Design a protein around this ligand. Structure first.
Ligand SMILES: COc1c(Cl)cccc1Nc1c(-c2ccncc2OC[C@@H]2COCCO2)[nH]c2c1C(=O)NCC2
Ligand SMILES: [Cl-]
Length: 324
């Protein structure tokens, strides 16, 4: 290979007839996500899935297959895995159902029952996912709490590869065209010069941490997008959240430095958040932190809750259903 290494990822084409109990989960800019059961015939397994459609265009099929290509390649516990595609008039993406929804909605809904240990563990897991993306030379370009999903309260994964770009071995930067991007998660060099790197992803990581530590506050709330570059050029940044020690806030501020190379590396963020996760109340101050429980797999109706009784026996999490 005179350039980069062959991508020998398998693309699995899933039969429409293998999918049952399709219900809408959510719709927005990402399109529409459904939940269902994937039943690979003659296997005696029922795999909870999400199914994503785009907003039958040739332009739509192109963009959904670009996301399929990116995801087919990624194998990490903190990144959404493509199970396959379904070739309906509109092409569909199939992934493991993340039953607790996106982490932004989760921290808003459960903001009175979320302790320091969950918040720091999520920061570690997101940094692990992002570090893996960097090892694969992938720039996500859309990291935000809305693009983190909750398998269980203890286990989150990065999703939405709609803006993701692969760098060649030679290459340091993605140079974008005129396409629309979430400005309030973007590094200043991305806003000003359409430059995207692993280090512009670290800026987005900082904003994502700020979203978690504020239990889902909107960054620069009620500031027009068009005013954001100016605010950042003046040296202004998101304020210290009430629960954050200077230790935690300083990591966020380092993610928002002007010199991209001065920002932390995801592998450094894994180390720092993991040390903090060993003594979480030294790093986040949450009223009532001590007495807080969220659902874990060792709960009465944990599995009963989000499934039908007739499916209970043969249900298999996609994480335990391995490339046959
Ligand atoms: C790219 O990966 C996926 C593939 Cl290949 C196939 C289907 C879905 C996805 N991923 C996504 C989910 C999602 C994933 C798993 N289980 C539940 C999910 O959705 C819960 C709620 C619904 O309501 C919206 C918020 O999330 N959700 C979202 C995306 C996503 O790309 N953009 C933002 C919203
Ligand atoms: Cl919002």
């Amino acid at each position: 290979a005179m350039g980069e290494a062959p991508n020998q990822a398998l693309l699995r084409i899933l039969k429409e007839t293998e999918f049952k109990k399709i219900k809408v989960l959510g719709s927005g800019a990402f399109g529409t996500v459904y939940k269902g059961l994937w039943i690979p015939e003659g296997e005696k397994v029922k795999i909870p899935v999400a199914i994503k459609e785009l907003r039958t265009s040739p332009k739509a099929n192109k963009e959904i297959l670009d996301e399929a290509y990116v995801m087919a390649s990624v194998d990490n516990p903190h990144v959404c895995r493509l199970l396959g595609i379904c070739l309906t008039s509109t092409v569909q993406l199939i992934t493991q159902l993340m039953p607790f929804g996106c982490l932004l909605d989760y921290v808003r809904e459960h903001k009175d029952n979320i302790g320091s240990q969950y918040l720091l563990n999520w920061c570690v897991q997101i940094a692990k996912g992002m570090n893996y993306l960097e090892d694969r030379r992938l720039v996500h370009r859309d990291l935000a709490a809305r693009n983190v999903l909750v398998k269980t309260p203890q286990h989150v994964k990065i999703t939405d590869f709609g803006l993701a770009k692969l760098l060649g071995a030679e290459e340091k930067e993605y140079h974008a065209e005129g396409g629309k991007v979430p400005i309030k998660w973007m590094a200043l060099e991305s806003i000003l010069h359409r430059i995207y790197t692993h280090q512009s992803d670290v800026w987005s990581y900082g904003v994502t941490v700020w979203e978690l530590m504020t239990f889902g506050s909107k960054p620069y709330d009620g500031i027009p997008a068009s005013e954001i570059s100016s605010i950042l050029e003046k040296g202004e940044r998101l304020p210290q959240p009430p629960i954050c020690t200077i230790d935690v806030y300083m990591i966020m501020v380092k993610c928002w430095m002007i010199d991209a190379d001065s920002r932390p590396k995801f592998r450094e963020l894994i180390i720092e958040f993991s040390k903090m996760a060993r003594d979480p109340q030294r790093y986040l101050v949450i009223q009532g932190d001590e007495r807080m429980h969220l659902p874990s797999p060792t709960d009465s109706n944990f599995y009963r809750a989000l499934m039908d009784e007739e499916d209970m026996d043969d249900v298999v999490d996609a994480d335990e259903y391995l490339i046959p």
